């Protein structure tokens with residue numbers, strides 16, 4: 115065993131192992147490349163079919179070994195690493211060997227050999243171009259040619275909940291801030307009326323034909339604060355992406371991992387308070403995509419329909435009625451008949467849908483876990499949570515997979531429990 119010299123596996127050998135249950139093929143490129151972005155100009159992007167994502171970026175994470183174990187990558191597995199180059203794999207190969215993995219090989223010919231021949235199977239996140247890497251945003255704001263972009267009008271929007279300091283403390287150059295209160299009402303925590311959305315989008319400089327790039331800043335939400343949501347900026351960004359896509363912005367992108375991805379890439383930060391450039395007319399009837407939103411009467415119908423389900427994206431203490439999740443909800447319990455899809459640790463964290471760096475979790479893992487609960491694309495799914503934020507992030511993950519009938523039930527537990535006639539469950543199921 116040599117911690118620093120790694121066996122090469124040939125293309126022929128790896129081809130013969132694609133179906134092996136005992137082989138784990140590990141893509142150490144960025145998660146955005148794994149999803150399908152052609153980050154080196156390859157003609158076919160994505161990953162080797164069956165490969166898992168383990169970005170070499172994560173080697174500096176003190177919890178690296180726990181990430182690997184949670185991915186079910188075990189020492190008895192044969193580990194095959196690849197990246198754009200075998201040199202990109204060397205540190206990861208050594209890290210596996212230092213932690214008791216004795217069967218570790220490096221595949222040298224993923225690019226250009228594997229990517230370049232159409233008989234070598236690859237996979238990709240179907241709608242990966244909605245989930246953009248920092249390098250794409252940098253090219254956009256620099257006026258440079260970038261893939262998956264044919265527009266001439268864009269805006270980069272920094273989302274926050276009543277927390278302008280989230281933006282003023284550091285933001286992507288030229289970006290403007292959007293408080294989530296611009297597009298959702300504090301009375302209902304639902305999306306605002308069409309007339310309000312039209313005015314708010316126009317005042318923020320957004321037309322239906324503007325490419326809107328949304329991101330937020332994660333600032334370590336604390337349940338002891340009056341407004342922990344003010345620190346969950348990137349959930350808020352995906353919430354606004356949902357409302358904008360519902361409203362009719364044709365081209366909405368989300369920066370994968372939010373602000374952390376921008377600074378991790380080494381790009382310059384701005385603290386300017388950028389004034390808005392208003393536009394006079396949104397340019398499309400609102401809402402253009404009403405099917406993206408489900409309200410309570412439709413949600414009740416979906417609970418009675420075989421081809422439909424509500425998907426509860428809340429924490430386990432919320433689900434069993436231990437806590438409400440919120441300092442503004444007193445009632446505790448759950449909507450009867452929903453399928454549980456645990457979000458993470460509480461209302462302000464999405465650990466089960468994210469990596470430690472806040473990029474979206476490897477989509478195969480989300481897909482496979484969902485399938486175990488019957489959360490599958492042949493259904494009409496309405497994702498929901500307390501009041502729509504976490505549900506929007508789950509919804510966006512399904513949208514990225516190309517699922518054809520996914521919605522957010524906007525009202526969530528807030529609306530449901532606000533009517534004392536609605537039934538609810540509590541306790542361990």
Ligand SMILES: C[N+](C)(C)[C@@H](Cc1cnc[nH]1)C(=O)O
Nearest residue numbers: 275303343346461462501503
């Ligand atoms: C709808 N507001 C903005 C009031 C929510 C947003 C939210 C974040 N994670 C769950 N919900 C809140 O901050 O509690």
Ligand SMILES: [Cl-]
Nearest residue numbers: 346347348349
């Ligand atoms: Cl966040």
Ligand SMILES: [Cl-]
Nearest residue numbers: 426448449527
């Ligand atoms: Cl619930």
Ligand SMILES: [Mg+2]
Nearest residue numbers: 303501502524
């Ligand atoms: Mg709501």
